């Protein structure tokens, strides 16, 4: 499914992402916007044979297991296919682990290039949260 902007912001807030590890809600909504355009079914092949999955484009080399990626680590200990549900629970849980890897949200390429250093609050603006 393709989440509405405010709909996703509300869902992420109930999942405890607002100010999680110091990152205000806007950061997470912005990351999802540029990583998957709020599409829970989005997937993109990478170059090391890995594939990125879901609304937060979680990688199959370090975070989830898709059974075909070289050097798999599965640090989130979860099948990548489980990160494609219309329910964001799995993606959020894994995202909380990724952001604690030692690089903060810099782990997300789209966040670095389109959200970091910007007015991310604009992404939750107008939402009745």
């Amino acid at each position, epitope marked *: 499914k393709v989440f509405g902007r405010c709909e996703l912001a509300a869902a992420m807030k109930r999942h405890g992402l607002d100010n999680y590890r110091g990152y205000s809600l806007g950061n997470w909504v912005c990351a999802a916007k540029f990583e998957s355009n709020f599409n829970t*079914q*989005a*997937t*993109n*092949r*990478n*170059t*090391d*044979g890995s*594939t990125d*999955y879901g609304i937060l484009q979680i990688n199959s080399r370090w975070w989830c297991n*898709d*059974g*075909r990626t*070289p050097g798999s680590r599965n640090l989130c200990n979860i*099948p990548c*296919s489980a990160l*494609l549900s219309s329910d964001i629970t799995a993606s959020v849980n894994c995202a909380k682990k990724i952001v604690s890897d030692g690089n903060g949200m810099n782990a997300w390429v789209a966040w670095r290039n389109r959200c970091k250093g910007t007015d991310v609050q604009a992404w939750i603006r107008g939402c009745r949260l």
Partner: antibody
Amino acid sequence: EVQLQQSGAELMKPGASVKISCKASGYTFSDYWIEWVKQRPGHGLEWIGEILPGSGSTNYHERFKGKATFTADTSSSTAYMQLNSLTSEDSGVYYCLHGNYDFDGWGQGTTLTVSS
Amino acid sequence: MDIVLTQSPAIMSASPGEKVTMTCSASSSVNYMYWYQQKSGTSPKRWIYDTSKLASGVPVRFSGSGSGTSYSLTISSMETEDAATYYCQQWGRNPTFGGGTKLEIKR
């Protein structure tokens, strides 16, 4: 024993669309990607794209975006590839296949001829 | 981006017992290389994955190696049934296959 059974040969006229099936068996259909490849004499092999049944997710090679569309029916464990706006250049053999640490068999291939 | 894979020799012949080596050169560096074997009239079969791992049923006389922009497939001792066309493939964002090396029997 995993198997991928494709539909038979196709003969289509230019401008039409065709849908090729790939019936899977021997494993959990929704847990594995099914890729597709095109083969033409002299041109070799070309990767088209892939689909992960059940999630509805798909990845396409940039050269096939807009030409191929993958769908799947979990009630029968069958994946499909639809090719639109057919031209003579689309004639060839098409394969569905697996590529992972558990198995990597290819379907028997489907021959497509596009001509008036 | 289109990564071009050039295989050589394009066509070669070998007698049983002979060592065979074929190369696959990439226009850009790739992390891993894959190889597939195809015999006339039948579907390709994955032969080597993740650069040096043998697919199921592949005999130990086959080996894969390489890195960066140069990879290879080697048969320690050619057997009659090894005659076929071998295609290399980079399995990245937009997978591409080499033009193949046609291995024929020398007589």
